[PDB]
């Protein structure tokens, strides 16, 4: 059994050939839209400080001016080609966009004295690159203001690389963000940080080679930035009312809060002076995720449809061009009004259809199996295809939002862990060889979906079974070859690769500077996650923390291996009281500055039992950024 | 193969016998607490208008003064006994509680002129009964004010039976509720209404007989009310700030918002004049659900722990007795301070431990499998046992909240529907007979957990396989006999019963009057759910609605079988414009008043294509309250 990337099976090739026949030949419409306003193309590379590649559009040349290969869904191939169109774009005079230099776009508005930006891209490196491409064709001006459209890393991530933290803290640079920005940005990207960043590798397929038999696109972007720096700079002005009008450097900004739709902290930006609506990631030219593969809170499709309709009503009649923080604009009022109506209907359908079927007694997987397509004319639009969000996943996500993972059947009340279930199922099926025979029967039949279910049990029962791994990877690859969903392709390709070759050595948060924006409260919330309860039991203690810089008191309590904190108060009977600054704390937990060294230097001043502070830091776990996904967890010692 | 309730197997009996040996003998402490302040006991029956039984404490006599049977977990049996203590209770002079006459409790505060209530129970029938028991021991006075502690049916459900809708709309009666009350009450109880009410029958085990081999308790209550009326009356004062002080009829009410913890719209009520904290359902004497079996939005354990700590700081030093909207109070500042600290730690552990393991790469079921108990002293408290919320479920729920149902493994990206998976698994295992052989092996071994997994595939592959159904029910019954979790027992017992005898004829929302509180916006949100997309495709239309009573305009749009609405606006080119009142609309959709009849009467006035309005109503589905859970649909 081979570990090599197999060609498309006859079944796969035939399946893709049939997709070619049934695609809307409306063609060039989105190509003309993606090309319109192109000032300077980009096909090059973005490198980091150490000369490592961060971004590379050149890797995708195989897509340009060529027809779809048998190993890639033709509809997916079309989207991939559109996403190859990168560079600096002029929407209108004074209104620019840098697209395809990062997963997200950067909107640049030319003000009276400087520049007003909508989003800062994913990394410092890509943010800098995007701004440099802009400065190659437009005069050098300072950044006067920044808008964070939502709490997603691809929008706030590159902030520090282009703006100064001190200028934001001073109010010199206005940084706008929707209600609940930090809370949600830190929960998603920091608190559940390690899990998300790793799961995200499957979503983007970053470590998978670029080619017709591997990584081709990610639906709303190509892939993610490698070997780069994620940053976080807290906003200065928060959008709290449903609508807020603010003018900065002679630029009229009209914010529409869209909380709990695409992101927990989210908003649209209307530009009155331009007759342009920036729909952030609320209406991209593909079905978005109600539940993201990387892992984040469920999204509300009802609210999402409501917010879209609100934009269509409030701005639809005064918008000449719709711009987004992913992909190309939509030109002309007529087209924008149709687009928004179509977008709204898609989210409303996802919600209402699932609730209709839920109330009929259908469970998550029954619902996903019964709704095969978008209704009426929605199935005929290019901008509504499941390139990013999957119809099945989104239907399952509505079920999750309203009811949860549990289907109501008590036989599913207490599922076994994958290894325990794997061993039992393999035995029940006649042992390893019997499952391998059935896997081969399924692959021959072209039932790749069943073969992956079969193989997963075997791989989890015995990760040392090489035939099981090769067959599992072969079936996933064929599934990836067939899928129109870019994210599903990426997940399947990553899975295939990791089954065959193991997990590649890469950490998305390696160079991450997001921990700087963290308040002491946020910081202790992370320590509460890091704390090893098993080790911490029998070590009840109270630690008081006084931040001389922030004039903030935190009462930390460790009880029964559980860490809780109180902001603004101090415990009178605290085992220890720690006097320091936020920077000093950062260094100690990041293992940059040693504890007795800080006491020696006088940066840390203790009152009471200092041993207790040392033992507290000894109870904290350190999360490895690598973890097995397609096979069981790498243990550690012998079992 | 038999359809009869089997006795406990030797394995089951032995397993339960061992539980008896290892339980905290702190006994009487919770019994003294549950009995304290009992004015008048209740063991009787509550009946509806038609003389049908609604509530019956008498059905649980088997628990009283008897030791746990073979067929019931002893820790569960203890809880069941405590939950049998029902009636009228005095916490303090002017402060009363009616407990065990409904799933929830009713708090009665005696004001200057009348009564100030905290919650109205689940149904009109139980609310009335509870208030009558109170009036048998205390003077007759009017209800001056009502507090809805949260958006749960067991708290707002009996409102109409004890208060007047007109008095609330007029401001004569003050009705307090936390921020987002109606939105969340309607979403949970109405929009996902049918699914929730039906799933709830498994959670409560309402249709399962009461006995040592069947329904015994529901952890925070006995079960739910049968053949009764759920009501909904909209509040008139909404608590929007984190803390709000309001005084009504000389009663000082201090509200603490606890949004997104136990319920999306939720709050605690501090009573300054009494030195009493009402923790609603935020700190009951059992682990609560982060994910409810009946189906609702995930709960935030982080926020939940944060809110508890905030109560402990803000009121802990000024509280003599803690009262709750389920179960008995906790007496004395020292005990209340320990309780709240314990409660907070439980929720914080659930969140933090799961996040710790999530970041270690553990998936939902691996996390549930690795954490077997609460840490340190938390495992030693009676009030922290998994009688209601399950530790496994709650850990799985934290994973759900942060990451979702999908574990990140692409082999689980597109699971087959139960029938398709059932057929494939059964075939893969050597066909029906081979699975039955393996099921029998599992049951003999006492591996009931594996037998239910095996049998589910078979029952879904062929629901006509009688041996598969009987064996599946037998295994679930044994699982029910073993469990400390009351909710899990109820679910297993309901499953067993329905596998053996099919779905009983009962609807929890049969007599429901909740649709009255619905705004036209809310009403059209329900119609959007009811709309049959398949039938509606090719019937694009625009319908304008003008409510003469409310002075509200609604623009309805049906496009590609998708129903959307705009509040406060009208479409100029609408296919039809409907002029009516909210009451008139209610009757048409409830099929009480016919369309041409309303036009004849002049209650419905049309402008444009009236045929289109008739075809619109023809596109609406009607949800049957009955649906198969433990076998394939119908
Ligand atoms: Zn986004
Ligand atoms: Zn984005
Ligand atoms: Zn309740
Ligand atoms: Zn509740």
d(CA A336, CA A323): 10
CA A263 / ligand 1 centre spacing (Å): 6
The shortest C-alpha distance from A495 to chain B (Å) reads 7
At what angle are helices B10-21 and B74-82 packed, to 10 degrees? 60
- Structural domain total, chain B: 3
Q: What is the rounded end-to-end Cα distance, in angstroms, of chain B?
A: 25
d(CA A310, CA A304): 10
CA dihedral B339, B344, B350, B353 (to 10 degrees): -110
CATH code of residue A544:
3.30.1050.10
For residues A180 and A275, state if they share a domain. yes
Nearest CA to A211 out of A382, A50, A428, A66 is that of A66
Give burial (CB, 10 Å; 0-12/13-18/19+) of B407: buried
Query: Residue B110 forms beta bridges with which residues?
Result: B115
For residues B29 and B109, state if they share a domain. yes
DSSP-assigned letter for residue A224: P
Using what technique was this structure determined?
Answer: X-ray
CATH code of residue A28:
3.60.15.30
Angle at B352 between CA B408 and CA B334, to 5 degrees: 155
Angle at B535 between CA B534 and CA B540, to 5 degrees: 100
For residues A535 and A435, state if they share a domain. no
CB contact under 8 A, B476 and A410: yes
All residues of chain A having their beta carbon less than 8 Å from the beta carbon of residue B412 are: 456
Provide the chain A residues 177-236 that lie in CB contact (below 8 A) with chain B: 187, 191-196, 198-199, 202
Last residue of a domain, one of B323, B345, B361: B361
CATH code of residue B367:
1.25.40.880
Cβ contacts of residue A540 below 8 Å, gap of 6+?
A558, A559, A560
The shortest C-alpha distance from B485 to chain A (Å) reads 12
Nearest CB to B627: which of A344, A361, A472? Answer: A361
Nearest CA to A67 out of A80, A48, A50 is that of A80
For residues A102 and A127, state if they share a domain. yes
Size of interface A-B (CB pairs under 8 A): 336
Last residue of a domain, one of A361, A394, A424: A361
The shortest C-alpha distance from A354 to chain B (Å) reads 8
Query: Residue A95 forms beta bridges with which residues?
Result: A92, A109
Give residue for tokens 């925070």: B220
The shortest C-alpha distance from B372 to chain A (Å) reads 12
CB contact under 8 A, A356 and B403: no
Give burial (CB, 10 Å; 0-12/13-18/19+) of B241: exposed
Cβ contacts of residue A151 below 8 Å, gap of 6+?
A177, A178, A180, A181, A184, A185, A188, A263, A264, A265, A266
Task: Say how many C-beta atoms besides its own lie within 10 A of residue B368's C-beta.
Answer: 25
Find the ligand nearest to B122 CA.
Answer: 3
Are B65 and B79 in contact by the 8 Å Cβ rule? The answer is no
Are A2 and A354 in contact by the 8 Å Cβ rule? The answer is no
> B132 in contact with A at a CB cutoff of 8 Å?
no
Binding-site members of B for Zn(2+) are: 150, 152, 154-155, 262, 281, 326
d(CA B427, CA B429): 5
CB contact under 8 A, B348 and A418: no
CB contact under 8 A, A366 and B633: yes
The shortest C-alpha distance from B304 to chain A (Å) reads 12
A292, A298, A413: best mutation site toward chain B, by most B Cβ within 10 Å? A413
Provide the chain B residues 522-541 that lie in CB contact (below 8 A) with chain A: 525, 528-534, 537-538, 540
Nearest CA to B102 out of B140, B136, B130, B77 is that of B130
For residues A452 and A517, state if they share a domain. no
- Beta strands B605-608 and A562-567, pairing class: unpaired
The domain of A549 spans 504-639
Q: Which two tokens stand for residue B441?
A: 């092996």
DSSP-assigned letter for residue A189: I
Last residue of a domain, one of A488, A503, A518: A503
For residues B303 and B438, state if they share a domain. no
Q: How many CA atoms lie within 13 A of B418 on its CB side?
A: 27
Are B391 and B287 in contact by the 8 Å Cβ rule? The answer is yes
Q: 3-class SS at A402?
A: helix
CA dihedral A527, A533, A534, A540 (to 10 degrees): 100
Give backbone dihedrals phi and psi of A66, rounded to 5 degrees, phi first: -120, 150
Provide the chain A residues 448-467 that lie in CB contact (below 8 A) with chain B: 449-450, 452-456
For residues B385 and B526, state if they share a domain. no
DSSP-assigned letter for residue A83: T
For residues B312 and B401, state if they share a domain. no
DSSP-assigned letter for residue A550: T
Give backbone dihedrals phi and psi of B594, rounded to 5 degrees, phi first: -70, 145
DSSP-assigned letter for residue B366: H
For residues A135 and A183, state if they share a domain. yes
For residues B429 and B515, state if they share a domain. no
Nearest CA to B254 out of B267, B264, B244 is that of B244
Strand ranges inside B374-529, DSSP E? none
For residues A188 and A301, state if they share a domain. yes
CB contact under 8 A, A361 and B566: no
For residues B514 and B554, state if they share a domain. yes
Are A301 and A348 in contact by the 8 Å Cβ rule? The answer is yes
């Amino acid at each position: 059994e081979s570990l090599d990337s197999k060609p498309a099976s006859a079944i796969t090739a035939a399946k893709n050939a049939e997709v070619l026949k049934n695609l809307p030949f409306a063609d060039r419409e989105e190509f003309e839209a993606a090309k319109r306003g192109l000032i300077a193309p980009f096909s090059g590379q973005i490198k980091n400080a150490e000369g490592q590649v961060v971004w590379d559009m050149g890797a995708y040349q195989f897509l340009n001016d060529k027809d779809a290969a048998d190993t890639v869904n033709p509809s997916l191939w079309r989207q991939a080609q559109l996403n190859n169109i990168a560079g600096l774009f002029e929407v209108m005079p004074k209104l620019y966009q840098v697209r395809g230099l990062d997963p997200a776009n950067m909107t640049i508005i030319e003000g009276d004295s400087g520049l007003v930006l909508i989003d800062t891209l994913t990394t410092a490196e890509t943010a800098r690159a995007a701004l440099d491409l802009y400065f190659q064709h437009r005069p050098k001006k300072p950044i006067v203001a920044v808008v964070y459209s939502h709490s997603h890393i691809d929008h706030f991530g590159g902030a520090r690389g282009i703006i100064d933290e001190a200028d934001v803290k001073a109010g010199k640079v206005k940084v706008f963000a929707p209600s609940g920005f930090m809370e949600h940005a830190v929960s998603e990207n920091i608190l559940a940080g390690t899990a998300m960043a790793r799961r995200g590798q499957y979503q983007s397929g970053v470590m998978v080679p670029r080619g017709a038999q591997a990584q081709v696109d990610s639906g709303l972007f190509k892939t993610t930035a490698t070997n780069a720096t994620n940053t976080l700079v807290a906003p200065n002005v928060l959008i709290e009312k449903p609508y807020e009008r603010h003018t900065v450097d002679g630029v009229e900004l009209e914010f529409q809060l869209t909380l709990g739709s695409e992101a927990p902290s989210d908003m649209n930006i209307y530009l009155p002076q331009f007759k342009v609506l920036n729909t952030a990631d609320n209406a991209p030219p593909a079905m978005h995720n109600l539940l993201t593969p990387r892992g984040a809170e469920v999204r509300d499709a009802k609210a999402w449809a409501g917010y879209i309709d609100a934009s269509l009503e409030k701005y639809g009649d005064r918008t000449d061009v719709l711009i987004q923080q992913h992909n190309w604009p939509v030109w002309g009022g007529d087209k924008v009004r149709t687009y928004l109506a179509d977008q709204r209907d898609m989210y409303a359908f996802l919600n209402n259809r699932a609730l209709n079927l839920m109330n009929k007694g259908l469970t998550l997987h029954e619902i996903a199996a019964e709704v095969s397509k978008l209704p009426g004319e929605l199935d005929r639009k290019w901008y509504l295809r499941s390139y990013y969000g999957a119809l099945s996943t989104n239907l399952r996500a509505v079920y999750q939002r309203y009811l949860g993972f549990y289907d109501g059947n008590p036989a599913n009340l207490d599922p076994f862990p994958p290894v325990e279930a794997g061993k039992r199922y393999v035995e029940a099926m006649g042992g390893a060889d019997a499952v391998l025979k059935q896997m081969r029967a399924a692959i021959d039949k072209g039932d790749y979906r069943w073969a992956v279910q079969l193989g997963n049990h075997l791989v989890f029962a015995d990760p040392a079974n090489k035939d099981a791994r090769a067959l599992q990877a072969d079936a996933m690859e064929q599934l990836g070859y067939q899928t129109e969903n870019a994210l599903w392709r990426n997940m399947y390709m990553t899975g295939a690769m990791e089954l065959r070759h193991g997990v590649p050595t890469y950490d998305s948060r390696g160079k991450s500077e997001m921990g700087r924006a963290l308040t002491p409260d946020m910081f202790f919330d992370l320590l509460a996650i890091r704390l090893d309860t098993d080790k911490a039991v029998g070590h009840d203690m109270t630690l008081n923390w006084v931040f001389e810089d922030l004039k903030q008191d935190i009462a930390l309590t460790l009880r029964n291996g559980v860490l809780t904190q109180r902001v603004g108060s101090l415990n009178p009977k605290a085992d220890v009281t720690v006097k320091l600054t936020k920077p000093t704390l950062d260094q100690i937990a990041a293992r940059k500055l040693d504890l007795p060294t800080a006491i020696k230097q006088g940066t840390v001043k203790l009152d009471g039992d200092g041993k207790k502070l040392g033992e507290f830091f000894g109870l904290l776990d350190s999360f490895s950024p690598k973890f097995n996904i397609v096979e069981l967890e790498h243990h550690h010692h012998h079992h």
